[PDB]
Design a protein around this ligand. Structure first.
Ligand code: FAD
Ligand code: FAD
Ligand code: GP7
Ligand code: GP7
Ligand code: HNH
Ligand code: HNH
Ligand code: HNL
Ligand code: HNL
Lengths: 425, 425
C-alpha cells in the first residue's frame, strides 16, 4: 500500500507524484497509456520524417504561467518562439488591416467600448470561488448571443469570434460567454493576453519536461487503466483493467474530466457533480498540423473561414513548412483532405497542401476530449465542486483549475493544491 | 422694457435671443464687443492677406454635437475637414509608430487596462447631476497624480498627457483628473472620441453661422458692456458702462464665466457660487496659428514638446501652410518667436516659421479666459450651481454646460435650457 496513488501521468499527475515523493511519501503513479505527458504529446511528425512536433499542448507564457516557468528553470529546459510573425493574410473583409491587430480606425470606438464591456464583465469573476458560486448565470449564455449584445462592426466582430473559436474549441453558438470571460480573468483580466499567451514553445518538445519530472518519480506503471476507486473501507482500493488492485491512504485522480464517468467510484461521487461528469464538458478543439509547399515564412491568418486561425509553425525546407490550424471537431473533419485544402486556400490561395497531422483526442479513450470547455449552463451549475476532494479522493487537472483552466499551468496549479491538501491531512 | 435681456453675443446668447424672439418674446441682446461670436472668432489672417482663419472655436462633430448639427442644417451652412492627415511626425520616443494611434504592440496590454480604468471612472459621472453632487472628490486631483496611478509605459503615457494638455489647456499638474473624465463622459463615455470630435470645420468660418443666427435677432446693441444686474425690484435692471439702463422681466447671462466677477449683482449671487466666480476657472488653452514654409501637407504631430500637438490647418501655397499648435498660456509665451521656432523644429526640423497668429483670450477683458477648465478642487465643490438661475437671472454658456462643457455644443445646450426655463415661467 502507498501513502498516495496518483492516477494519470499528464503534467498534473507527474507534479503531484514527484512532489509527494519529495515530501517523503510513498507514491505510486498509474498511467493508462504507453507514454507519460497526456495532452502534452510531442512526437515525430507523420508527414516529415525526423521532425518532432507538438500534437497537443505546446504554447506557454512565463508571465501568465509562473508554475510552468518554475519547472523550466528547475530543469534548465530551453524554450523559444516557434516563429517570428510578419506576414498577415486575414479574411476579415476589405477594411481590415494586414497586421496582428487588424482593426481599422473606423472601428476604434466600437472596440474601445467593447473592451470596457468585456473587462467589466470579466471583473465580475473571482477566481477562487467557482463559476457556480457567484451569481454569474446571466453571463452563462451562448457566446454568439453575448457578442450580438456588443454590436461590433465586422472586422472586430469576426476577429473576436475567430480567436474565441480557436481558443475555446467551440463554435460561437455552443460556447459559453461566461467561459470566455473566465479565460479573460485568468490572464490577469486581459482580452489581449488570451492570445498573447502564445508566447513560447519547448525547444525540444514538451517531452523534455515530461522526461525531467518523471526521472524523479520512483514508481510508475504504464498501460495500467484504472476502472475503480473504492474508499468504503479504511484504505482506498484502486482496481485496474487487468491487474491486482493497489491500495493507498489517498488517491489523486489526474485523468481528464471526460474520462471520470468511466471509473466506478465507491461510494458514488456527491450527487451535484454527477450529471456534469456524465455529460462531459463540451470542448471540441481540433489542432491540425498542415504540411505545405509554397508558403512564405511568418504567416498568420485569422478570419471567417472554417479554420478561424491558420499560422506558421516550423520550416521543413526552403520550400516546405508546417502551419497550424485550429477549428473544432464538431464543425470539421480533418480526414477530409479536400476540406483541408479549401480551408487553407481560402486564406492562402497560392499554397499547396502536402499532408496533415493531428490526434483525434475526442475519440481517444484515455481522453474523450481535448482541452476543457463547458457546455452552456454547465459551469454556472457546478464548477469548483468538480475539483474538490470527495473523502480521500482528490480531483486535479487542467480541466478543473479555477485559476488557469485548459492550460498546462492549470494542471500544475491543481497538483499544487492537492499535494498541499494531502500534506496538511 | 423687454421680456428678456440676453447679455453676451456668443453662440449661447445668439441662440437664446433668437429662440425667445421666435417664441414671440420681446428680446434685447447686449454685446460688449464690436462683433458677435465671442470665442468663435473667424477673421482675416494676420500673416496671410486674404486668408480667413479661426482664431478660436473651429472644430465640430455632428454625432457628438447634434444641436450644432441642427444649426448647420437649418441654415445650410457648409462644413468639411480642414485637411486629410497622412503624415505623422511624433515625438513619443523610438518605439512609437508614426500613425494616428502611435501605440506599439509592446504597450497594448497597458493600454487595454488603462482603457478599462479610465472608462470605469468616467462611468461614475452622471451628466445631469453636477460634478459637486456625486461623491466624485476622490477623482478631483491633479491629472499627473491620476495618471501615475495608471502606470503607463512611455508612448501611451506621453500620448495621453499630450492630448490632455492640448484638450484641457492646462499642464498635467494643474488639470483635474475629474475634468478629463468629464470630457470622456461628454463624448458618450469615450476616450478616443475626445480627439475624434475634431471632425469638421466651417467651410466659410464660424461667422457663417454667427451671421445666419443674428439675422433672426431684431434688436442687438454692440459695444455695450454690462456692469450691473439688479433684481431687487419687480423688474430686473441692467446697467451699462456708458448708457441708460435697460429693464426686463428676465436676464440671461451669456458672458464667459471668468467675466462674471466684474458684474455687480444685486443682490449678491448665492454664496456657494461666489468663491469659484471670484477665483475664475483655470483654463489657459493657447491655440497658435503658425505660418510655415517647407511643410508637407497632412502633418500631424503629437509628443512631449512644449507644443503637445502640432497639426495641419490650411494650404497657403505650393510651399507655405498654416499649422496649428496647442499649448497653454501659463507654460508658453507666443510673442517669443524664438520659442515658437524651437517648439516647431522639435517636431519638424526641416520647416521654417514665417509668422504666428493667435488671440490672447486671457488678457481680453471680454473673456478673461479661453475655454473652461476647472482648477483642481473647484468643480467637485460647485458645478451645477454655477449654471442655475438665481431668481430671474439665468446663467448660460459653454463654461457651465453639464453636457458638453468647453464646446460650441455646450453653449447651444445651455441656451436651450434657459429658453425653456423662461418659457415655462
Ligand atoms: C490540441 C491541444 C492543444 C493544446 N495546446 C495547449 C497549449 O498550447 N498550451 C497549454 O498550456 N495547454 C495546451 N493544451 C491543454 C493542455 O495540454 C492540457 O490541459 C494539459 O496537458 C492537461 O494535463 P493534465 O495532467 O490535466 O491531463 P492529461 O495531460 O490529459 O493527463 C491525463 C492522463 O490520464 C491518463 N488516463 C486517462 N484515463 C485513465 C485511466 N482510467 N487510468 C489511468 N490513466 C488514465 C491519460 O492517458 C493521460 O496521460 C492543449 C490541449 C490539446 C488537446
Ligand atoms: C482658442 C479656442 C479654441 C476653441 N476651439 C473650439 C473648437 O474647436 N470646437 C468647439 O466646439 N469649441 C471650441 N472652443 C470653445 C468655444 O469656442 C466656446 O466655448 C464657445 O464659443 C463659447 O460660447 P458662449 O456663447 O458660451 O461664450 P462666448 O462665445 O465667450 O460669448 C460671450 C460673449 O459675451 C461678451 N461679453 C463679455 N463680457 C460682457 C459684458 N459685461 N457685457 C456684454 N457682453 C459681454 C463677449 O464679448 C462674448 O461675445 C474654443 C475656444 C477657444 C478660446
Ligand atoms: C482628454 C484625454 C484624451 C486622450 C486621447 C487619447 C486617445 C486619442 C487617440 C486619437 C487617434 C485615434 C485614431 C484611430 C486610428 C485611425 O483613425 O486610423 C487608423 C489607426 O489605426 C489603429 O491602430 C487603430 C487601432 C484601434 C485601437 C482601439 C483601442 C481603443 C483603446 C482606447 C485608447 C486609449 C487611449 C490611450 C490611453 C489607421 O488606419 P486604419 O487603421 O483606419 O486603416
Ligand atoms: C477568447 C477571446 C479572445 C479575443 C482576442 C482578441 C484580441 C486578440 C489580439 C491579439 C493580437 C494583439 C497584437 C498586438 C499588436 C502587436 O503585437 O504588434 C503591433 C500591433 O499594432 C497595434 O495596432 C497595437 C495597438 C494597441 C491596441 C490596444 C487596444 C486594447 C483593446 C483590446 C482589444 C479588444 C479585442 C477586440 C474586441 C504591430 O507593431 P507595433 O505596433 O508593435 O510596432
Ligand atoms: C502573432 N500573433 C498575434 C496574435 C497571436 C499571435 C501568435 C500566434 C502564434 C504564435 O506562435 N505566436 C503568436
Ligand atoms: C488625425 N487625428 C488623430 C487624432 C486627432 C486627429 C485630428 C487632428 C486635427 C484634425 O483637424 N483632424 C483630426
Ligand atoms: C493555449 N490554449 C490552451 C488550450 C488550447 C491552446 C491553444 C494554443 C494555440 C492556439 O492557437 N489556440 C489555443
Ligand atoms: C474641441 N476643443 C474644445 C475646446 C478647445 C477645442 C480644441 C480644438 C482643437 C484641439 O486640438 N484641441 C482643443
Amino acid at each position: 500500500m502507498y501513502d498516495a496513488i496518483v492516477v494519470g501521468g499528464g503534467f498534473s499527475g507527474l507534479k503531484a507524484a514527484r512532489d509527494l515523493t519529495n515530501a517523503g511519501k510513498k507514491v505510486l503513479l498509474l498511467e493508462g497509456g504507453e507514454r507519460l505527458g497526456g495532452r502534452a504529446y510531442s512526437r515525430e511528425s507523420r508527414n516529415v520524417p525526423g521532425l518532432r512536433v507538438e500534437i497537443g499542448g505546446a504554447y506557454l507564457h512565463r508571465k501568465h504561467h509562473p508554475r510552468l516557468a518554475a519547472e523550466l528553470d528547475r530543469y534548465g529546459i530551453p524554450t523559444a518562439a516557434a516563429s517570428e510573425f510578419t506576414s498577415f493574410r486575414h479574411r476579415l473583409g476589405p477594411t481590415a488591416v494586414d497586421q496582428a491587430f487588424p482593426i481599422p480606425g473606423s472601428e476604434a470606438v466600437a472596440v474601445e467600448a467593447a473592451t470596457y464591456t468585456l473587462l467589466r464583465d470579466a471583473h465580475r469573476i473571482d477566481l477562487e470561488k467557482g463559476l457556480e458560486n457567484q451569481d454569474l448565470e446571466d453571463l452563462d449564455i451562448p457566446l454568439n448571443e453575448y457578442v450580438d449584445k456588443l454590436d461590433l462592426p465586422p472586422v472586430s466582430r469576426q476577429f473576436l469570434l475567430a480567436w474565441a473559436w480557436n481558443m475555446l474549441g467551440q463554435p460561437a453558438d455552443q460556447a459559453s460567454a461566461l467561459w470566455m470571460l473566465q479565460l479573460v480573468a485568468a490572464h490577469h483580466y486581459s482580452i489581449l493576453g488570451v492570445v498573447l499567451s502564445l508566447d513560447e514553445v519547448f525547444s525540444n518538445g514538451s517531452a523534455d519536461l515530461v522526461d525531467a519530472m518523471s526521472q524523479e518519480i520512483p514508481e510508475i506503471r504504464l498501460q495500467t487503466v484504472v476502472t475503480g476507486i473504492d474508499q468504503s473501507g479504511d484504505v482506498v482500493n484502486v482496481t485496474v483493467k487487468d491487474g491486482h488492485a493497489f491500495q493507498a491512504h489517498s488517491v489523486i485522480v489526474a485523468t481528464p474530466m471526460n474520462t471520470w464517468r468511466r471509473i466506478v467510484f465507491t461510494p458514488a461521487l456527491p450527487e451535484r457533480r454527477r450529471s456534469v461528469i456524465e455529460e462531459g464538458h463540451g470542448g471540441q478543439g481540433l489542432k491540425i498540423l498542415i504540411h505545405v509547399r509554397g508558403a512564405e515564412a511568418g504567416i498568420e491568418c485569422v478570419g471567417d473561414g472554417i479554420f478561424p486561425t491558420l499560422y506558421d509553425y516550423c520550416e521543413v525546407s526552403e520550400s516546405e513548412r508546417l502551419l497550424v490550424a485550429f477549428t473544432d471537431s464538431g464543425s470539421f473533419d480533418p480526414t477530409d483532405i479536400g476540406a483541408v485544402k479549401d480551408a487553407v486556400l481560402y486564406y492562402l490561395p497560392e499554397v499547396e497542401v502536402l499532408g496533415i497531422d493531428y490526434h483525434d483526442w475526442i475519440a481517444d479513450p484515455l481522453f474523450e476530449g481535448p482541452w476543457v470547455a463547458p457546455r452552456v449552463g454547465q459551469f454556472s451549475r457546478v464548477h469548483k465542486e468538480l475539483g474538490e476532494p470527495a473523502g480521500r479522493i482528490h480531483f486535479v487537472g487542467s480541466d478543473v483549475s479555477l485559476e488557469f483552466p485548459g492550460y498546462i499551468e492549470g494542471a500544475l496549479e491543481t497538483a499544487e493544491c492537492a499535494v498541499n491538501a494531502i500534506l496538511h491531512s
